[PDB]
Amino acid sequence: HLHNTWETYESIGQVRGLKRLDNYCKQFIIEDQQVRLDPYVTAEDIEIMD
DNA sequence: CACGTACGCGCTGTCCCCCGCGTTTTAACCGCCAAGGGGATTACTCCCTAGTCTCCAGGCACGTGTCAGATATATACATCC
Question: Who contacts A36 (Cβ-Cβ below 8 Å, separation ≥6)?
Answer without folding.
Answer: A46
